[PDB]
Structure 1
């Protein structure tokens, strides 16, 4: 059918943080994206009677805002009435950050259609990069625009030689796509052995998704743990990733080719659930100490 963005009217648009965390100094509520918070998009809507099956409308999400959670959004996004009948079937496209909805025959069977929705949403981590920074969360529902600034904190700890986080959970296979940051403080080491141990997941050695990048600018370390890899220096082939424990352990000597190094690394990985969907533990063995970071998951 035809684009009926001008016939679908959204009001009381809101973006909330659930649950939200307090900044311990300033007392403002913030989006702590690695401490269980999500965003919630809400709105009321009315649909004009001139709407028919096959007509379409869009949700356009801005550069810092997207549907979904830590887990990437489904391509399927439906608009349901209060009893669970499908008013419209939608297709989310991550390339355009837009959902395109198509009305069902529901609108041909009912008039004066009015309701409301709630949707779990998140930061677009690639663009909303930096701790304690306010980002503009923007959506356009039909032709109705809304923007609100949200303060994000991912909890990067830049003084840590080793820190890791979930970049995203894959919606289709539930793989944990991980980011680890090695040597943010730019210390100098003669030993630098990087180990990941999985509980409840496995690596796939042949999937070619264990990537090692050599940081050339400190700002490539984005607090969001979703770096733009197309601009990083890919040095994966210069290292030997060694698997063991039935592909549940990967060990890498980051000192390879050197006796002393102040190099800094971003490492990305894919850990596939064994079956539910576990623990991922990292260690970095150095001259003086063994650093640890764990991420734990229900």
Structure 2
């Protein structure tokens, strides 16, 4: 522990705001920009010090973030962008921790606000128009409001949604023939922008026993659906996939697919289901549904790390290295080990300063260059998921 739990010294007032296509109707429209925004205004007792922390427990029904998992929380800042506290999230306890920086040692009368976007757990908020008691605990005080969620699961030939996204793939859910019309020669093409298929293994096919299984949240209980054992799936040359369901009659199907994120993709991704079928009067047609999702693959994990070496220009052991925000607030500290190496891991993607604390009478040798700025020797580093710059420092007598 860097400090103590100071929930009793952080005084927070909370409200919710519904965003997206259902705001006028007081509903979170999960497939129309719907999110639940949590807005927190707080004050902090002057006795709080660097390393102390407060918590936000998201309770039973929601998590911070939206589609990309694992979920994360951002740092919290003052009006000038100075970091007041570092945000971390623990998935097992669905709780965020906000750990105060040296901001609280530089300033008194610490106060601020911040907001979080949040989404429901789709396995608990399962049903369109479900009103759930969204109870959270903010710095040790409960706040609850009932919130209505709606996924717009229409009883139609084809509808699909993105269940979740990870750095490597999305899980895409396609519902076929919920209207239970008589259909023959049923084929489904799954296609994307920013995504591709490589193997039939990325696609699972399920026949529903009854309509109860078409869960509105598009996160079905697959453990209670038996896969079609040998589905007919072809991976096309364009990276799409075609599933031949055959003469399904009035049966309903769910297709659970895991299209891969494309390296280098940056933009508004799309996942689309096209369902081609023939009806009871021998008319063949194609219906389609598409869902959009903004992402940058290089930043999709949302965090990364970096390190480097310090030496006398002999490894320099036990040199203090601080991680600062661009305004000079201390976010973390470490020391070089016996080999002269240091590192910082699990850093939210963004820009940082790396401060090397000079031993008396030493200066660096000679972006990643260690320069004298605002009384400190610092390099600049930009953190993304992977391939971050190594940040080294050679030291010489002044």
Q: Residues 76 and 204 (structure 1 numbering): CA distance in 2 closer, same or farther, change over 3 Å? A: farther
Post-superposition, which runs of at least 4 consecutive aligned residues in structure 1 deviate over 6 A? none
Which residue number in structure 1 is paired with residue 273 of structure 2?
282
Choose 191-200 or 56-65, whichever is displaced more. Answer: 191-200
The whole-number CA distance in structure 2 between the counterparts of 1:282 and 1:76 is 32
Q: State the 1:209 CA deviation.
A: 3.4
Choose 70-79 or 54-63, whichever is displaced more. Answer: 70-79
Which residue number in structure 1 is paired with residue 207 of structure 2?
214
Q: State the 1:72 CA deviation.
A: 4.2
The whole-number CA distance in structure 1 between the counterparts of 2:9 and 2:249 is 62
Question: What is the root-mean-square deviation of aligned Cα atoms in Å?
Answer: 2.5
Contact 1:77 1:92 in 2 (8 A): no
Which residue number in structure 1 is paired with residue 105 of structure 2?
108
Contact 2:184 2:249 in 1 (8 A): yes
Alignment equivalent of 1:78, drawn from 75, 78, 92: 75
Q: State the 1:22 CA deviation.
A: 6.2
Structure ID, larger Rg: 2
Contact 1:214 1:232 in 2 (8 A): no
| Structure 2 counterparts to residues 142-221 of structure 1, below 5 A | 142-158=139-155, 160-170=156-166, 172-173=167-168, 175-205=169-199, 208-221=201-214
The whole-number CA distance in structure 2 between the counterparts of 1:33 and 1:60 is 22
Task: Tell me which of the two structures has the higher relative contact order, counting C-alpha pairs closer than 8 angstroms and 6 or more residues apart.
Answer: 1
Which residue number in structure 2 is paired with residue 270 of structure 1?
258
The whole-number CA distance in structure 2 between the counterparts of 1:156 and 1:291 is 19
Q: State the 1:138 CA deviation.
A: 2.0
Structure 2 stretches lacking a partner, 5+ long: 295-398
CA displacement, residues 118-142 of structure 1 (integer Å, 9 cap, x when unaligned): 2222222221111122222222111
Q: Residues 216 and 51 (structure 1 numbering): CA distance in 2 closer, same or farther, change over 3 Å? A: farther
Which residue number in structure 2 is paired with residue 8 of structure 1?
10
Q: Residues 86 and 281 (structure 1 numbering): CA distance in 2 closer, same or farther, change over 3 Å? A: same
SS in 1 for 2:154: coil
CA displacement, residues 22-41 of structure 1 (integer Å, 9 cap, x when unaligned): 67xxxx42221111122211
Q: State the 1:73 CA deviation.
A: 6.3
Q: Residues 128 and 48 (structure 1 numbering): CA distance in 2 closer, same or farther, change over 3 Å? A: same
Contact 1:215 1:232 in 2 (8 A): no
Choose 71-80 or 86-95, whichever is displaced more. Answer: 71-80
Contact 1:80 1:88 in 2 (8 A): yes
TM-score between both structures, scaled by the size of structure 1: 0.84
